[PDB]
């Protein structure tokens, strides 16, 4: 039946999702010979997208009735992403439906669709707020494929890039009800090469007036490709 050694090889021919065993995997046998072995749909541990050149794990199954050896229980190896050249992005599982879900992306504004079949690890469960790494493909329909679980505290949606930066309020934030503005905001001008940066009333205690000197921290919001001034406070000693 199935051999017990964990074999390592590369995908020579991917499966066409758009011959019962059309796939091909090239590996090095224990006797240092180069071997090609076929595989089919059920030979992958999950219905995820395998690609030409992917490093994979598999077990060798011998079918005496079909008179051929087969690669089975194929799983994608993480080392592929170190040599793949594909764009790997980060995010967290935002919602879970039946068969699909949506991810909150680090570098993208919109929620990203993803099929449950693209989760690489079939040994563990998926939950909300799971930190994941994926590859985005386009078909105007976007989806995340080859989704890998990330260790805790690996995903940061915003980064502190500077602290105690000083500038001048060149457009006061709109005098605002209970809901906090997150679109209009104000404008702070600082020469830290003069630059502008947006601030919002939610990120200051006591709103600064137009033309007043302020001190603030700068955070990089990656999904918006912009920085935001927070912890805004007035400066008396200029
Ligand atoms: C678009 Hg994520
Ligand atoms: C230092 C006055 Hg905006």
Author numbering: 3 to 20, 28 to 148, 156 to 192, 194 to 209, 212 to 257
What do the authors say?
Here, we address this challenge by presenting the results of our comprehensive and systematic investigation of Upstream of N-Ras (Unr), an RBP with multiple RBDs and a model system for understanding sequence specificity of modular RBDs toward target RNAs. In female flies, dUnr, together with Sex-lethal (Sxl), represses translation of Male-specific lethal 2 (Msl2), the rate-limiting component of the dosage compensation complex (DCC) (Abaza and Gebauer, 2008; Abaza et al., 2006; Duncan et al., 2006), whereas in male flies, dUnr has an opposite role and acts together with the RNA helicase Maleless (Mle) presumably as an RNA chaperone to remodel the lncRNA roX2 (RNA on X 2), which promotes the assembly of the DCC (Militti et al., 2014).
CSD456, featuring only one canonical CSD, binds with a KD of 16 μM, comparable with the affinity of CSD1 alone (Hennig et al., 2014a). Similar observations were made for CSD456, where ncCSD4 and ncCSD6 flanking CSD5 do not show major CSPs. Overall, CSD456 and CSD78 mutants displayed decreased stability when compared with wild-type (WT) CSD456 and CSD78, as established by measuring melting temperatures using differential scanning fluorimetry (DSF).
